[PDB]
């Protein structure tokens, strides 16, 4: 019936493809990132997803159990499947906290991101809130209070810490309460995000100059298309959105009937996830194009006002459509006055704005707040959208935490020492203690680091190990025979070829390209807020941050080889 479709939609639609995907798309030029994602979908999404589902269905065990049954000296990879997930639980719930924050400041008629604060004379506006948008100022100063550089970090901000604690308490409450009622919750928690996105798409399409963002997002600029970073980010983003590497898919497939259809399920899940990501990107980039058009018009209006004031022209004489001609006439009339203010004139174009209108890890928040502030009843739409985002994040965190706790629940030794319910509380407390780091003044930089590298290489390596083990260790023919015995209609040659020599080769090639690019450039930099310019400036990563990122990647990557060496020693 429709219950299965709703469950598939709920498993496919999450906070990931709604939040992380638009930011990655904006960072890597839009279309130049959109094209690989579709390419990385039909090559890596469906085949690997179907492989994981088939393994979970055939093995009838958990991730650790399945990867131990496949091979002893490989069982440690299952442990890695938890560790990476743990790192996700380290930071992902922090996003929910931000949602809570943006929810809590949604019951005021003077919305905090709607009107800039006064400078102090009650005559103008703050310099930071004037150079930057009101939403940007509220996000970077009144919400994150971000430091200009990563080197200087302040104390733990109390309000974000309280928001994070509330988010963890909500997660723990949902863990304790919700165990099998989700079938009813699927009737409501699967269609609301689509309705919210439809409403926001309508609002964006009703805004002036919104088609520019849609054109930008669909424009495949070949100059930035050759960047291996875009391919790597698309691959890790689709792997994260589909849940590959986390092992939750295997656990879910182990709970289904042996005769349950898997190819149709995997294809439907992948296609729904891709379509939802594309739709969210469409809406977000429509609002982003609206912002870029507004900034371009504001810059042109400021330039025209400055020229009119300093050359005493008529109010309506100078317009955007005839700017350069009037500039040439002024230069030809008296070049002395024109040159007296030539450096003050600023050249602003739609391309530059669309490149650097809004960027960073909080692109979705800023963009949707801008969309909200131009509504009719801003509070209602703000509350609805933030509640939808919070629900999606809660569902994603519930899935991640269940995947983490399942191997711990299966641990007989741990179960016999402590109550099963107290394990969830201990895990939540530890995760909150670890994630309190993100609540500092410079916690946004660490959040960006853990969103860029704590799941980039780890997921790729885990998927590569899994597909190598399936294709060559266990034997492709044996797996195909087992699947045919279980359900019939053996895998077509397309799936066999993809599992044998397409996906692993592409993953290895992408990893080699990324490593070569990193070695050649050697200039891994991060964006940092600049209140003086009211923008984002690239700054080189410090030694300690690079070491921390390297350690975070290395632990997840070496979780499997260390256990393999231990198993080899035990056998020997």
């Amino acid at each position: 019936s429709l219950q299965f479709v709703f469950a598939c939609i709920s498993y496919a639609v999450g906070l990931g493809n709604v939040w992380r995907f638009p930011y990655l798309c904006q960072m890597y030029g839009g279309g130049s990132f959109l094209v690989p994602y579709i390419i990385m979908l039909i090559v890596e999404g469906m085949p690997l997803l179907y492989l994981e589902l088939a393994v979970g269905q055939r093995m009838r065990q958990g991730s650790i159990g399945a990867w131990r049954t496949i091979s002893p000296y490989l069982s440690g990879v299952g442990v890695a499947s938890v560790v990476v997930s743990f790192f996700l639980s380290m930071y992902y719930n922090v996003i929910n906290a931000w949602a809570f924050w943006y929810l809590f400041h949604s019951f005021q008629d003077p919305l905090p991101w709607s009107v800039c604060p006064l400078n102090g004379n009650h005559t103008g506006y703050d310099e930071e809130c004037e150079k930057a948008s009101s939403t940007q100022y509220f996000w970077y100063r009144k919400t994150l209070n971000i430091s200009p550089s990563l080197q200087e970090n302040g104390g733990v901000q109390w309000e974000p810490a309280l928001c994070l604690l509330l988010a963890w308490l909500v997660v723990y409450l949902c863990i304790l309460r919700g165990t099998e009622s989700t079938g009813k919750v699927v009737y409501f928690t699967a269609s609301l995000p689509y309705c919210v996105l439809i409403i926001y798409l309508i609002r964006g399409l009703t805004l002036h100059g919104a088609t520019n963002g849609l054109m930008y997002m669909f424009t495949p600029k070949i100059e930035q298309l050759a960047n291996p970073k875009a391919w790597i980010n698309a691959a890790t983003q689709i792997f994260f959105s589909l849940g590959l590497g986390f092992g939750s898919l295997i656990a879910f497939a182990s709970y289904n009937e042996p005769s349950n259809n898997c190819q149709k399920h995997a294809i439907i899940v992948s296609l729904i996830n891709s379509f939802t990501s594309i739709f969210a990107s469409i809406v977000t980039f429509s609002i982003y194009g609206f912002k870029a058009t507004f900034n371009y018009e504001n810059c042109l209006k400021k330039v025209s006002l400055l020229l009119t004031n300093t050359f005493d022209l008529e109010d309506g004489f100078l317009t955007a459509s005839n700017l350069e001609q009037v500039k040439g006439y002024l230069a030809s009339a008296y070049p002395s006055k024109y040159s007296e203010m030539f450096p003050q004139i600023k050249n602003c174009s739609l391309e530059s704005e669309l490149d650097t209108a809004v960027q960073g890890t909080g692109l979705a928040f800023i963009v949707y707040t801008e969309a909200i502030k131009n509504m009719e009843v801003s509070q209602l739409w703000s509350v609805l959208y933030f509640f939808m985002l919070l629900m999606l994040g809660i569902g994603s965190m519930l899935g991640n935490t269940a995947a983490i706790l399942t191997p711990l629940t299966d641990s007989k030794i741990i179960s016999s020492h402590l109550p099963k319910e107290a394990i969830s509380g201990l895990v939540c407390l530890v995760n909150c203690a670890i994630g309190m780091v993100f609540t500092m003044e410079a916690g946004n930089y660490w959040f960006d680091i853990f969103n860029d590298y704590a799941a980039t290489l780890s997921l790729l390596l885990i998927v590569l190990v899994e597909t190598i083990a399936v294709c060559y260790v266990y034997g492709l023919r044996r797996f195909e025979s087992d699947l045919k015995a279980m359900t019939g209609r053996a895998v077509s040659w397309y799936w066999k070829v993809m599992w044998a020599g397409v996906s692993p080769l592409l993953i290895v090639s992408l990893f080699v390209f990324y490593l070569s690019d990193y070695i050649l450039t050697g200039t891994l930099k991060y964006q940092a807020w600049d209140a003086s310019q009211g923008q984002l400036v690239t700054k080189d990563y410090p030694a300690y941050a690079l070491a921390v990122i390297g350690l975070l990647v290395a632990s997840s990557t070496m979780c499997i080889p260390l256990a393999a060496l231990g198993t080899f020693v035990q056998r020997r």
């Binding site: 809590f104 006064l118 304790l176 005493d312 109010d315």
Partner: protein, 166 residues
């Protein structure tokens, strides 16, 4: 210094510069700025001066439209005006008093031409937007406290029921 400059004028020290942007504030349906509009503006300035001299210094000075002298008129509608004594040309009201008078009654001048503090700039008189009123303590804190309380109550009751069942 041998020579002279063609910019200095004896009335430049006490002159207040007005810049008017009718097209930006009104878009369409914008009236033309002929001499009648200048007469109306001078009358409004004289009225503001009368109001300041009556309600602050308690002096009845009969200003007129001919006591607001205007110079350097431009197509931008940008000029310099200064107010003299009612019948003493050699007496020019100091710029501080004129600025205080304009600040006192800028709303009437703004409404006379349907302009709002951005299309009628006096270049030295900076308007005040107004202090932003704040909630009693915090709406967000109250909502957060209520949500945290209900969540804690739910957690406690669920834990108690689970313990009692087993």
């Amino acid at each position: 210094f041998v020579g002279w400059s063609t910019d200095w004028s004896p009335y430049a020290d006490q002159s207040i510069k007005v810049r008017i942007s009718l097209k930006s504030a009104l878009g369409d349906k914008a009236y033309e700025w002929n001499d009648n509009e200048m007469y109306l503006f001078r009358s409004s300035v004289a009225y503001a001066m009368r109001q300041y001299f009556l309600k602050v210094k308690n002096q009845m000075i009969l200003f007129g439209e001919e006591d607001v002298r205007v110079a350097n008129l431009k197509p931008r509608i940008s000029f310099n005006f200064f107010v003299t004594a009612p019948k003493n040309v050699s007496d020019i009201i100091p710029r501080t008093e004129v600025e205080k008078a304009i600040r006192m009654s800028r709303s009437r001048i703004n409404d006379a031409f349907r302009l709002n503090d951005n299309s009628l700039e006096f270049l030295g008189i900076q308007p005040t937007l107004g202090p932003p009123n704040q909630p009693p303590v915090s709406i967000w804190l109250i909502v957060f406290g209520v949500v945290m309380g209900v969540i804690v109550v739910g957690i406690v009751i669920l834990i108690f029921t689970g313990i009692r069942d087993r």
